[PDB]
Design a binder for this molecule. Sequence first.
Ligand SMILES: CC(=O)N[C@H]1[C@H](O[C@H]2[C@H](O)[C@@H](NC(C)=O)[C@@H](OP(=O)(O)OP(=O)(O)OC/C=C(\C)CC/C=C(/C)CC/C=C(/C)CC/C=C(/C)CC/C=C(/C)CC/C=C(/C)CC/C=C(/C)CCC=C(C)C)O[C@@H]2CO)O[C@H](CO)[C@@H](O[C@@H]2O[C@H](CO[C@H]3O[C@H](CO[C@H]4O[C@H](CO)[C@@H](O)[C@H](O)[C@@H]4O)[C@@H](O)[C@H](O)[C@@H]3O)[C@@H](O)[C@H](O[C@H]3O[C@H](CO)[C@@H](O)[C@H](O)[C@@H]3O[C@H]3O[C@H](CO)[C@@H](O)[C@H](O)[C@@H]3O[C@H]3O[C@H](CO)[C@@H](O)[C@H](O[C@H]4O[C@H](CO)[C@@H](O)[C@H](O[C@H]5O[C@H](CO)[C@@H](O)[C@H](O)[C@H]5O[C@H]5O[C@H](CO)[C@@H](O)[C@H](O)[C@H]5O)[C@H]4O)[C@@H]3O)[C@@H]2O)[C@@H]1O
Ligand SMILES: *[C@@H]1O[C@H](CO)[C@@H](O[C@@H]2O[C@H](CO)[C@@H](O[C@@H]3O[C@H](CO[C@H]4O[C@H](CO[C@H]5O[C@H](CO)[C@@H](O)[C@H](O)[C@@H]5O)[C@@H](O)[C@H](O[C@H]5O[C@H](CO)[C@@H](O)[C@H](O)[C@@H]5O)[C@@H]4O)[C@@H](O)[C@H](O[C@H]4O[C@H](CO)[C@@H](O)[C@H](O)[C@@H]4O)[C@@H]3O)[C@H](O)[C@H]2NC(C)=O)[C@H](O)[C@H]1NC(C)=O
Ligand SMILES: CCCCCCCCCCCCCC(=O)O[C@H](COC(=O)CCCCCCCCCC)COP(=O)(O)OCC[N+](C)(C)C
Ligand SMILES: CCCCCCCCCCCCCC(=O)O[C@H](COC(=O)CCCCCCCCCC)COP(=O)(O)OCC[N+](C)(C)C
Ligand SMILES: *[C@@H]1O[C@H](CO)[C@@H](O[C@@H]2O[C@H](CO)[C@@H](O)[C@H](O)[C@H]2NC(C)=O)[C@H](O)[C@H]1NC(C)=O
Ligand SMILES: Cc1cnc(NC(=O)c2cc(S(=O)(=O)N(C)C)ccc2N2CCCC2)s1
Ligand SMILES: [Mn+2]
Lengths: 655, 110, 112, 95, 33, 76, 100
Amino acid sequence: LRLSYEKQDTLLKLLILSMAAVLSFSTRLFAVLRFESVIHEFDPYFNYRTTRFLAEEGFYKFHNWFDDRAWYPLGRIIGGTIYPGLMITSAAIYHVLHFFHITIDIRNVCVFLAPLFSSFTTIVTYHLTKELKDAGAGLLAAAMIAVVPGYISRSVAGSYDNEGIAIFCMLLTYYMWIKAVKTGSICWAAKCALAYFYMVSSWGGYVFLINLIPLHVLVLMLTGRFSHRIYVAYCTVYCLGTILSMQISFVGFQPVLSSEHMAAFGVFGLCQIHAFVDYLRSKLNPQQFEVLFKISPWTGRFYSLLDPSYAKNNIPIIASVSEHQPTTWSSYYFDLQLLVFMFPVGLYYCFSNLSDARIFIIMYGVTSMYFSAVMVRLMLVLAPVMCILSGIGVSQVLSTYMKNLDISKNEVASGMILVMAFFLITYTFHSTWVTSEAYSSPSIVLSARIIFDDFREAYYWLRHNTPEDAKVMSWWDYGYQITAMANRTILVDNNTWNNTHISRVGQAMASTEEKAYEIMRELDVSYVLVIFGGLTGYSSDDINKFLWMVRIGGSTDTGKHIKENDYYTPTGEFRVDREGSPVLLNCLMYKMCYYRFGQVYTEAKRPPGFDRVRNAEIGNKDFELDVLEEAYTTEHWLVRIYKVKDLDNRGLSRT
Amino acid sequence: SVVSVISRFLEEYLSSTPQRLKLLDAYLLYILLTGALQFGYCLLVGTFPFNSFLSGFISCVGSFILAVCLRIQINPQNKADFQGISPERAFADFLFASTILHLVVMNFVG
Amino acid sequence: PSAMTVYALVVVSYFLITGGIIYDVIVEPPSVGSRPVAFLAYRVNGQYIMEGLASSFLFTMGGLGFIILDRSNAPNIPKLNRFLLLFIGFVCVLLSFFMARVFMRMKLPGYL
Amino acid sequence: KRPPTVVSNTFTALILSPLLLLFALWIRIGANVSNFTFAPSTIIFHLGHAAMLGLMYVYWTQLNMFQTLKYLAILGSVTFLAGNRMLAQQAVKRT
Amino acid sequence: MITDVQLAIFANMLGVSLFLLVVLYHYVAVNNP
Amino acid sequence: SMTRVIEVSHWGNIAVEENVDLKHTGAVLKGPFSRYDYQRQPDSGISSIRSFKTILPAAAQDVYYRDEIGNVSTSH
Amino acid sequence: IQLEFVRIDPFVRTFLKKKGGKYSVQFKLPDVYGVFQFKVDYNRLGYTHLYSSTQVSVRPLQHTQYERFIPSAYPYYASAFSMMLGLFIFSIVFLHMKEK
Ligand SMILES: CC(=O)N[C@H]1[C@H](O[C@H]2[C@H](O)[C@@H](NC(C)=O)[C@@H](OP(=O)(O)OP(=O)(O)OC/C=C(\C)CC/C=C(/C)CC/C=C(/C)CC/C=C(/C)CC/C=C(/C)CC/C=C(/C)CC/C=C(/C)CCC=C(C)C)O[C@@H]2CO)O[C@H](CO)[C@@H](O[C@@H]2O[C@H](CO[C@H]3O[C@H](CO[C@H]4O[C@H](CO)[C@@H](O)[C@H](O)[C@@H]4O)[C@@H](O)[C@H](O)[C@@H]3O)[C@@H](O)[C@H](O[C@H]3O[C@H](CO)[C@@H](O)[C@H](O)[C@@H]3O[C@H]3O[C@H](CO)[C@@H](O)[C@H](O)[C@@H]3O[C@H]3O[C@H](CO)[C@@H](O)[C@H](O[C@H]4O[C@H](CO)[C@@H](O)[C@H](O[C@H]5O[C@H](CO)[C@@H](O)[C@H](O)[C@H]5O[C@H]5O[C@H](CO)[C@@H](O)[C@H](O)[C@H]5O)[C@H]4O)[C@@H]3O)[C@@H]2O)[C@@H]1O
Ligand SMILES: *[C@@H]1O[C@H](CO)[C@@H](O[C@@H]2O[C@H](CO)[C@@H](O[C@@H]3O[C@H](CO[C@H]4O[C@H](CO[C@H]5O[C@H](CO)[C@@H](O)[C@H](O)[C@@H]5O)[C@@H](O)[C@H](O[C@H]5O[C@H](CO)[C@@H](O)[C@H](O)[C@@H]5O)[C@@H]4O)[C@@H](O)[C@H](O[C@H]4O[C@H](CO)[C@@H](O)[C@H](O)[C@@H]4O)[C@@H]3O)[C@H](O)[C@H]2NC(C)=O)[C@H](O)[C@H]1NC(C)=O
Ligand SMILES: CCCCCCCCCCCCCC(=O)O[C@H](COC(=O)CCCCCCCCCC)COP(=O)(O)OCC[N+](C)(C)C
Ligand SMILES: CCCCCCCCCCCCCC(=O)O[C@H](COC(=O)CCCCCCCCCC)COP(=O)(O)OCC[N+](C)(C)C
Ligand SMILES: *[C@@H]1O[C@H](CO)[C@@H](O[C@@H]2O[C@H](CO)[C@@H](O)[C@H](O)[C@H]2NC(C)=O)[C@H](O)[C@H]1NC(C)=O
Ligand SMILES: Cc1cnc(NC(=O)c2cc(S(=O)(=O)N(C)C)ccc2N2CCCC2)s1
Ligand SMILES: [Mn+2]
C-alpha cells in the first residue's frame, strides 16, 4: 500500500526468485530422505573416487596420474583422459568450507553438489530470459526450470555426474554470448570465452557450443543482419575460446584438426571474407568493384547423433545402454508436461519479432529438439531451452490477457488467467509425482519395506577377504564400482577405451570351459563376479545382457567361432530351458550362473529349479564346474563370486 | 589494368582517414607480417613441436583480431551499433582481453 | 524469405518428431494391438504408430489453439468472427490438455 | 628430425625485422608522445602494465600456474585501479 | 528425519504458491504507472 | 583394533562412536563356500557366527550401525 | 638365467650377470607404459622350478619432464615475446599522441 512501486516490484521479484531456488533445491532430495546419503549408479562411483584423490593430494599430483587399478595388464591414465571440471569445482567447494572450519566430509559435499548447482541454474535461467524479453517473462521460466521432471532425473541428490552441473555451464555461456551479441563489448565476449573454457573442461558435450554459435552467426548473416556487434563478439569468442579449449590435456589439438570443430573456423574465415568486402564496398564504387570482382573425419560417436541408425549397424557398444534409443510420445510428455504445448507458442512469438538475440534461441530449440528425438539421453539439452521458450510464451499470453481486465470483455479475459493458473498447478503436481514415484530409485539398493543390499555385501566381502592383489573380472558395466568399493584391480572398466580387451573378456565368457580357462591365464585373473539376479527377479541379469557379451566378443580378429545365431534354438529363440541349444547350456557364463541352482524352490508352486526372470526351468540341472571352484554367493543369489583354480599340481589335463 | 583503382583507393585512404587511426593500421600490418613469417617457416620446415607453432601463431591471430576490434569501436562513424561504449571503455577492454590471451599463450607454449 | 513460411515448416517438423517418427523409422513397430488395443501396456517408451501420431497431433493442436487465441485479440474484428475464433481456440486448448492427460493415463495405468 | 640450427637462427633473426619496420613506419607517420604529463596515476598504470608483461615472461622460465596467478591477481588489480583513474582523467580532458 | 510424504506435500504447496505469486507479479507488472 | 571417540558438548549431549575391526580366529576356512549348503543344512557352518548382541548403556538415543561403504540395513 | 620384462608377452628378455653373489642386469625401460612384471623363470631339467615375479608399474611421463626451450622452435617463442612488446609500445603511443 504505502510501499512505492519500485520497492514492491523488487521485493516481489526477490521473493519469487528465492522461493523458486528453495523449491528446486528441495525437490531433488527424495533419494536421500528414503535411503541414506550414498552416491548411486555406475558412473558417480568414479568421479567420487577421483575427486577424493584430488582433495587429499594437490592438483599438480592429479593432472598427471597413472591409475594402475583398471585394465590390469594395460592401465588407464586418469590425468589426461577425463574432463577435470567436476573434480575441481567440488575440491574447491570443499577446500573453501575447510578454510572456514566447516570440516564437512568429502562424501557429503560430493553428494549434495548436483542439487546445489540446480539452485544456481534457476538464477541464470531467469536472467537468460530477462535478456530476450522483459523481466515479466523471466520469473515464469525459473520456477518451471526448478521443477522440470526430465532435468530432475539426471540431477537428484546422489548423482555426482557431470550432467546436472553441465546445464548450468551451458546456460552461463549462452547468457554471456547473448550479452556479447546484444552489446558487442570485447569484455563481454571475453567473459564468454571463459565460460566456454569452464564448460569444455566439465562436459564432453561442448561440440554443441562450437556448432550452434557458427550456425547462429550464419543465420544472422544469410538474412542480412550481420552488424559489427556480432562480428566483434564472434571473432573474440572464437580466438579466446579455442585457445582456452586446447589447454585441457584430453582435448589436445582437437579444435584445429578435427571435422567437428571445423564449423567455427569456416565461419571465422567467412566472417573476415565478409567484413573486408563490406569495407571495400563502402570506400569504392559499383563499376570498380565489379571490375575487381590431415583433418580427421567425423568420429563415429558424434556421427551417431546425425544418422540415428549408424549405431545399430556399426557400433555394438553404444546401442547396449538402454538410454540410447529414440524418444516416444510417452517420454516427452512424461518428462515435460505442458511444456510441449508451450513450445510452438514460444516459437511463434519469437518468429513474430526477430532480433539478433532471438534468432539464436530459435536455432537452439530447433537443433536441440531433433537431437533429443534421436536419443533419449540428450533430454538434458532439450528441457532448459524448451523451458525458456515456455517462459516466453505463457507470460506473453498472460500479458495479453492481463490488460483486458477492467481493474488494470472481462469474463473472457479472466477465463484465460484462471486456465493458465490451473495448467501451472497441474504441471507442479505432475512434476512432483514424476520425481517421487519413478525418477528416484537407488541403483545399488534393489527394494520392493524389504531391502536387498547384496551389491554392497559382495563388494565388501571382496574388499576384506581376498589377497591384496586380486584380479576380479566382470563385465565392463560394474568396473567403476568394483574399483571404488571392492578396491580390487578389475580387468575391464566402464570407459571402454580398448575395444579388444573388452572383446577378450567377452570371449572368455560364452565359450567352452577350456577356451575360457586358457583366456583366463594370460591376464592372470583370479576371481570372477557374475550378477545372477535369477532368484530375486532382477531385470538386468547377466544372462539378460549375455547377448551383448556374445556379440562384442565375436566381432574382432581374435575370435570368430563365437558367431551369433548359434546359441539360439532351431527357431532362433533365446530359450534357456532344457530345449535350448546345447552350446548355450555349456558356455562358461551359464555354467557359472546356474551352478547348483536346479534344487532351490524359488516359487510356491513351480518346478524345483525355476527361474523367475525368464519364467522357464533350467536345462542343465546338475553339473560341476571344472575350473571355477565357488568362493561366495550372496544371501539372495544376486551376485556370485567364483575363483579361477590354479594349474594342476601333478600336471593333469583338467584344472 | 586493375592497378589504377588500387592506387586511387590507397590515395583516398591516405587523406580521408584521421591520424591516431593510421597508426592502428600500421601495428595491424606488423602483426599480419609476423604471422605470415611464422606460417612460412612452418611450411618450410613443418612442425616438430606443434603446440609451439600453434600457440606462437594464435598469439598473433588473436592480437590482430583484437586490434581490428579496437579500430572498429574507436571509429566514430561506427558509433550507432555500439551504444554507450566510449573509446576509453574500449581500450581498457582490449587491454584486458589481450592480457588473458597472452597469459593463455604463455601457458600453452613450451 | 517469408519468415512465417518457416515457422510452418518448423511446426510440421515438430509434429513429426513429437510423434516419434525417428523411433518408427529406426525400429519399425507394428501398428496393431494384440481385439486391438492401441496403447502399449507398461513400457515408458514403447510407441505404436497409432499412439505416436495421434498423441503428437494433440500437441500441435495444443499449440495452434493458443496461436488462434492470441490472433483473435486483434482489434477491428467483427464480433461474429471474434466469438467463433475464441471459441475454437478455447476448445482446442482445453481438449488437447485433457485428451493428452487421458492418453498418458491409459498408456501407463497407475499414473498419479 | 629437427632442422639445422642455421635455419632456425636466421628465421629468429628475421622475426625481429617486423618490429623494427613498425618503428620505421611510425616515425614516418609522425606519432609523438607530447601528451604525456608525468602524472602519478599514468606512470603507475604504465609501470604496472610493464610489470604484468614482464611477469608473463617470468612465469615461463621459473614459476608455476599457482604462483603466477596470485601475482597477477595483485599487479592486475593495481594496474586496473590506476588505469581507471587515468582513463577517467583522459575522458574528462577529451570532452 | 522427514517423511517422504511430508517433503512431497511441502514441495506441492511451495510450487503452487510460487506460481500464484508469479501470476500476481505479472498483474503488478502490467499495472505499472 | 577398536577406536573409541568420546566427544563432549556442554550444549546438549555427548556422542560416542567406535570403529571396530573384528576377525574370526580359529579354523581358517579351506575349500569352496556354498550358500546353498549354508541355507538348506543346519549342520553346515557350525563355527560360523551369524550375529552378535551388543549391550548399550540404556540412554542411547539414535544408534547408527554403518560400515565403511554405507549404512547397513540389518540390525535389531 | 633369463630375466623377462613382460606385460602380456615379453617386451624385454636379457641375461642376468653374476656380480658378488647377485644376478644383476641394467636395462632401459620400454617406451610402452602400463603395468609390467619382472619374471625371472629358471626351469631346467633335473632342477627346481623358479618363478619369481615382481609387479612394477611404468607411468607414462610428467608435464614437468618434457624438453623445453627447443632450439628448433626458437622463431615461435621470439614471436610471442615480440607481440607482448609490440602491444606495450602501441599502448603508450595510443594513450599519448597529439594530432597534427
Ligand atoms: C564407445 C566409445 O567410442 N567410447 C570411447 C570412450 O567414451 C567414454 C567417454 O570418454 C567417457 N567420458 C569421460 C569424460 O570419461 C564416458 O563419457 P560419457 O558417459 O558420455 O560422459 P560425458 O562425456 O561427460 O557426457 C556425454 C554427453 C553427450 C556428449 C551429449 C552430446 C550433446 C550434443 C548436442 C552433441 C552434439 C553433436 C553434434 C554432431 C554437433 C552438431 C551440432 C549441430 C547444430 C549440427 C550442424 C552440423 C554442422 C556440420 C554445422 C555446419 C555449420 C555451418 C555454418 C556450415 C559450415 C560452413 C563452412 C564454410 C565449412 C568450412 C569447410 C571447411 C573449412 C572444409 O564414457 C564413455 C564410455 O564409457 O572414450 C575413450 C577415450 O578414453 C575412447 O577411446 C579412445 O579412442 C581414441 C581414438 O581411437 C583410436 O583408435 C582407433 C581404434 O584402432 C586402434 O585402437 C585399438 C584400441 O586402442 C587397437 O586395438 C587397434 O589395434 C588400433 O591400434 C583408431 O581407429 C582411431 O583412428 C584412433 O587412432 C584413442 O586415441 C584413445 O586411446 C588413448 O587413450 C587411452 C586411455 O586414455 C590410452 O590408454 C591410449 O594409449 C591412448 O592414449 C593416448 O592418448 C591420450 C589422450 O588421447 C594421451 O593422454 C596418451 O598419452 C596417449 O597419447 C599418445 O598417443 C596419441 C596417439 O593418438 C598421441 O596423439 C599423443 O600425442 C599427443 O598428445 C600428447 C599429450 O596428450 C602431446 O604431448 C603430443 O604432442 C607432442 O608430440 C607431438 C608429435 O607431433 C608434437 O607435435 C608436440 O609438440 C608434442 O608436445 C609435447 O612435447 C613437446 C616437446 O617435444 C612439449 O613442448 C609439449 O609441452 C608436449 O606436449 C600430442 O601429439 C601421445 O603420443 C582411446 O582408445 C572410446 O572410444
Ligand atoms: C540404516 O541402518 C539402520 C541400522 O541398521 C537401519 O535401522 C534399522 O531398521 C530396521 C528395519 O528393518 C529396524 O528393525 C526393527 O527392529 C525392531 C526390534 O526387533 C527386535 O525385537 C522384536 C520384539 O521381540 C520382543 O517380543 C518377542 C515376542 O514377540 C520376544 O520373544 C522378544 O524377546 C522381545 O521381547 C523381535 O521380534 C525381533 O526379532 C527379530 O530377529 C529375530 C532373530 O533374532 C528373528 O527371528 C525375528 O523374526 C525378528 O525378525 C528383534 O529381536 C522390530 O521390532 C521392528 O519390527 C517392526 O518392523 C517389522 C518389519 O520390519 C514388523 O514386522 C514389526 O511388526 C514392527 O513393525 C523392526 O524389525 C531396526 O531396529 C533399525 N535399527 C536401527 C539401529 O535404527 C535403517 O533402516 C537403515 N536405513 C535404511 C534407509 O534402510
Ligand atoms: C527440425 C528441422 C526443421 C528444419 C527447419 C529449418 C528452419 C531452422 C532455421 C531457423 C532460422 C530462423 C530465422 C529466420 O527464419 O529468419 C526469418 C526468415 O528469413 C529467413 O531466415 C530466410 C532464410 C531461412 C533459412 C536460413 C537458414 C537456413 C538453414 C541454416 C543453415 C527472417 O526473415 P526477414 O528477413 O526478417 O523478413 C524479410 C522478408 N522480406 C519479404 C521482407 C524480404
Ligand atoms: C571459470 C574459469 C576457470 C575454470 C577453472 C576450471 C579448471 C580447469 C583447469 C584444467 C587444467 C588444464 C591444464 C592446466 O591447467 O595446465 C596446468 C596449469 O594448471 C592450472 O593452472 C589450473 C588453474 C585453474 C584456474 C585457471 C583460471 C583460468 C583463468 C585464465 C586467465 C599446467 O601448467 P604448469 O604446470 O604450471 O606449467 C609449468 C611449466 N610452465 C613453464 C609451462 C609454466
Ligand atoms: C585399497 O587397496 C590398496 C592395496 O593395498 C590399498 O593401498 C595401500 O594403502 C596403504 C595405506 O594405509 C599403503 O600403506 C599401502 O602402501 C597401499 N598399498 C600399496 C600396494 O601401495 C588402499 O589403501 C585400499 N583402499 C582403502 C583401504 O580405502
Ligand atoms: C556405452 C556408452 C555409454 N555412454 C557412452 N559415452 C558416449 O556414448 C559419448 C561420449 C562422448 S565424449 O565427449 O566423451 N568423447 C569420448 C570425447 C561423446 C558422445 C557420446 N555419445 C553421445 C551420442 C552417441 C555418442 S558410451
Ligand atoms: Mn557421466
